[PDB]
Design a protein around this nucleic acid. Sequence first.
RNA 1: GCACAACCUGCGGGAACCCGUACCGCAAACCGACACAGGUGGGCGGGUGCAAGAGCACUCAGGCGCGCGGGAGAACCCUCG
RNA 2: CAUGAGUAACGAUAAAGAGGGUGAGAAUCCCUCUCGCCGUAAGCCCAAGGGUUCCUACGCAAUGGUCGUCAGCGUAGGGUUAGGCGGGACCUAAGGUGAAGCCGAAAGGCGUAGCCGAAGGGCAGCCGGUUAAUAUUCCGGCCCUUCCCGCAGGUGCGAUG
RNA 3: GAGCCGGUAGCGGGCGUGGAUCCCUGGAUGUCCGAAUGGGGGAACCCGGCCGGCGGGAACGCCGGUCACCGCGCUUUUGCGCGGGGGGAACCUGGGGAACUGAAACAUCUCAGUACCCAGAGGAGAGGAAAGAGAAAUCGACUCCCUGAGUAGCGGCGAGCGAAAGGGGACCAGCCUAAACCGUCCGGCUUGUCCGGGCGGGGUCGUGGGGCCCUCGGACACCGAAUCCCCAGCCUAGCCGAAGCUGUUGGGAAGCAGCGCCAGAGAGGGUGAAAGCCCCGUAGGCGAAAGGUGGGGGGAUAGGUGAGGGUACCCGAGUACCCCGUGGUUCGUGGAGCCAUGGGGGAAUCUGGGCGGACCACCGCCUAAGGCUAAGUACUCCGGGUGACCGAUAGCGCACCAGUACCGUGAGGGAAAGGUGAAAAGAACCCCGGGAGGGGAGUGAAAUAGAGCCUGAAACCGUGGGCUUACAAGCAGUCACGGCCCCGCAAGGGGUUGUGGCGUGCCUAUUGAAGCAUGAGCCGGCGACUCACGGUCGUGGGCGAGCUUAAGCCGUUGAGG
Lengths: 110, 67, 94
Amino acid sequence: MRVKMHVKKGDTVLVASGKYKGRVGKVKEVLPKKYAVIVEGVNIVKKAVRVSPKYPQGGFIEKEAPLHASKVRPICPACGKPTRVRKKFLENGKKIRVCAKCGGALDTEE
Amino acid sequence: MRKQLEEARKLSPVELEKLVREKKRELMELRFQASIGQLSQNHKIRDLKRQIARLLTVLNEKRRQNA
Amino acid sequence: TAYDVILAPVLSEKAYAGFAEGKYTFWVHPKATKTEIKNAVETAFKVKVVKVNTLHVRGKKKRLGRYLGKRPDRKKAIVQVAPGQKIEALEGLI
RNA sequence: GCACAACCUGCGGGAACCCGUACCGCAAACCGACACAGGUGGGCGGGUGCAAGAGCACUCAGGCGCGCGGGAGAACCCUCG
RNA sequence: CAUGAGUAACGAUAAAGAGGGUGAGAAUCCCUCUCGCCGUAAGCCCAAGGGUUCCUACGCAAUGGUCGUCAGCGUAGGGUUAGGCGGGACCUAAGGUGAAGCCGAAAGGCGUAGCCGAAGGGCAGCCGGUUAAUAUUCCGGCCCUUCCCGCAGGUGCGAUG
RNA sequence: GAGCCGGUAGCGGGCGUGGAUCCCUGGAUGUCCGAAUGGGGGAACCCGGCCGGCGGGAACGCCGGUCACCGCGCUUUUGCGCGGGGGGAACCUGGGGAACUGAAACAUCUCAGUACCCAGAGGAGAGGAAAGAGAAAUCGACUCCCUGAGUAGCGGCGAGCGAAAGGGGACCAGCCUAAACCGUCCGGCUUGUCCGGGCGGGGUCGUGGGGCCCUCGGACACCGAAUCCCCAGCCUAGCCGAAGCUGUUGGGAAGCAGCGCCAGAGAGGGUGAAAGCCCCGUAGGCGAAAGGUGGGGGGAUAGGUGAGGGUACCCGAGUACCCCGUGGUUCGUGGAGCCAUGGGGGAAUCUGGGCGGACCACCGCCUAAGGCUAAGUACUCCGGGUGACCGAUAGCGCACCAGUACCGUGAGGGAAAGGUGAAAAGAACCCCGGGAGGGGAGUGAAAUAGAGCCUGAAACCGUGGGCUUACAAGCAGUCACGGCCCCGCAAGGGGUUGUGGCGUGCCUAUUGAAGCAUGAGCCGGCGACUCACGGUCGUGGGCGAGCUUAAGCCGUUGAGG
């Protein structure tokens, strides 16, 4: 939780929570880790405006706070994140490797 | 428009001259716009300014190289 | 530096009528010489600078939560045509 | 230097920018920490009457009615007969 | 946070009464009608100084020494433009500066000259009309101002000593 | 490394893994003011003269490049080409320089060369190779620390004030120029043989230097940046990086419980209540760059140093020195020395001349009246870190739109206000109402957590209930008892009082107070016998000879030696 981070759009687990049921992290800041797991919001029973239906009450409430979420999940769930061994000419690949592994290859899924 | 960075690289005296001048006029156009299209304009304004700015950065670079 | 442009039309109401038959009013770079008006005028809108006058105004009365202010400097200048040409679209407009 | 292109003088042609006005402004907006009856510069100061007159009394225009109200109205200070 | 106190006090003894109106509510806003006090001022006017505000539109919980649907109050928007008005684009006194110069332990003291420096000098317009709002600045009628290019006529013209 | 269009989140539109946000280093215009300097001027705004440009050309007017002053050296003609100036919290040098208070008065004296006005060099200057010390046939630059005695001493010898060599320590380069003599030279005057100024050898370190005669001499030394190349220390971006889940009481768990885990890294904070194994690029260790800075280690660049006697001498300051008029200094007038200067006098080249002892006779000392700089103590703007250092009236006053509000003419003075909650889910919607605001619904774990909204007490005002009160004289009260009402099993315990007994309120300064002497408006938070040394007496503790400053050194803990 700093100028540096955890997972990004990613897809991860909820340990100390109420859901645990991991899923799509719609957006995650740089400093306040502020990340939305699309896993628990509300309605803000909207303005009474025609902003929302003239008869409103916003629906998708999803600002995800706490940072006990168990980011990253290869064939393994709760795991920290490795770093590199480069291996290839100019190779950062700070992919995530521990027990199972996941790096969010630019392919099949984030 | 790093590409624009390029064109930049490309032109010289009277060129960059009237280029940035006319472009500038363009942004004027914007100024005018201050109450019409507007919405998608935004960018014509901010970026266009940044652009012409570059124009100047260059003139400086070149003729500076000169004298 | 030398980017000729130096203005923002006087979207102002009262100023309208003038636009309407022979003169036109606008906001101009608080500074341009009146002859500056004549030139920006002339080469800018391809016209015939006639009667170039000037006025200025700063802002008064803007309360800001816990502190306050009243705005910056808005400059006014009016220039007239020779035949009644140019500014067309602008004018039909507002 | 001028004096052949300097100045005096007509007509034609063409020029002329910078900062300024709003309104208050013998005064609740200027000065007394207050919508404080204090002070603060020059412009006839309309008219009738009075010997004269910006004083006098009623007024011209023009300006008000002071900004907390109604109430009976005895003590007594005030103001005045 | 109490207390005399819900008494003392409302800023001038230049008085006001009505009708209708608008309003959630109008002694305390708007018209209009009776009425008193100014008038030589409670006139208008330039200037100073204030610098918002002025207007037009909404609003009043704060503010006016209660009111208050009123405001110079709050919110927003628009509002003053001049070759000839003024001041500089010129003149200068007192007077400040100050190249020189005389002078202090230092910082300065004194200072011609040239300069800065005034509703004191000097200079070319006025009146009638138009905006919520500004005017000899805008419009219009009428009257000019110098400086530049020329041409036409005219001359020892030509400093600022 | 994959998200950003600063604090605004909202509107209305976007850029970007063909390194977008952003961290750094060097880039570009870089408005007008401010040393301002082209001129003026109430700064932050009005004027002007030169070449370029554009426009309606000339007049107008903008971008532009343009044009003080100073002294400073150069071609006297470039007046071309430099310098400075303008700052800066504290430290710093010199310039000039004060009352209080003490001396329980106070004129010598005192605070003190302190406060303050100034000028100025810095990043630190200051001082800095001896006409020194000191008396031993001794030392050896300068500066700062400990010690040197608070003795030696200065003095209405009174208040008081108060050294210096040495020693312990730290830090240790030393280097130079006119100094006529050399010759060289150009100018000289005026010509021969004087002066003037350039090159030098000489360019004194603890004493020679020069000129004549002879012995001479044929590779180790670097600066105070001489100087250059580097590992350039950093600057700000870097990187990794140790191990748990199941359960479980909970709105929560990181907690209780179960088993499995790390560790050259149990420093800390952060993740809805207290984790080594969850967040943290930290302690673990390592990391890294082509710019901006150098001591080291080494090189090279190395100016310039680095011999012997002989001989008539000429060769570091214009004033030393002595009279009085004065400064320093532990010295205040004195037997009073040395350095230092304001007046008048007014010279010596190493048999020279000040210095030890006022002075005289001695020995001894040092070598003056020029020049340069490093290194060790100071200082704190600014950065980092640690705190038997502070919690919102203490802390900077100042924890965040406080050096601003606001008073003063200016000079100048100089507040307050920190927290809703775990996260915004912070309040659709219905109902009295002009509005506020008020009842509901939803929030939620709570909303007596609801927007000035945590914890949220005292003071004061309020709504209801208990006892009590209209023949009463009293700070208060309070001992007694009787009537009420209360918990009560009773014992009895509560609150409330009518009858009666006896009762001058507290602080300060008083022979002396009820005060009519005083302080006292009520609540709340602030609100005052310390610290450093000297000492001094005690007494708790180590040896009798007992104890250790300044430092050098090891030092998460930094461990003490």
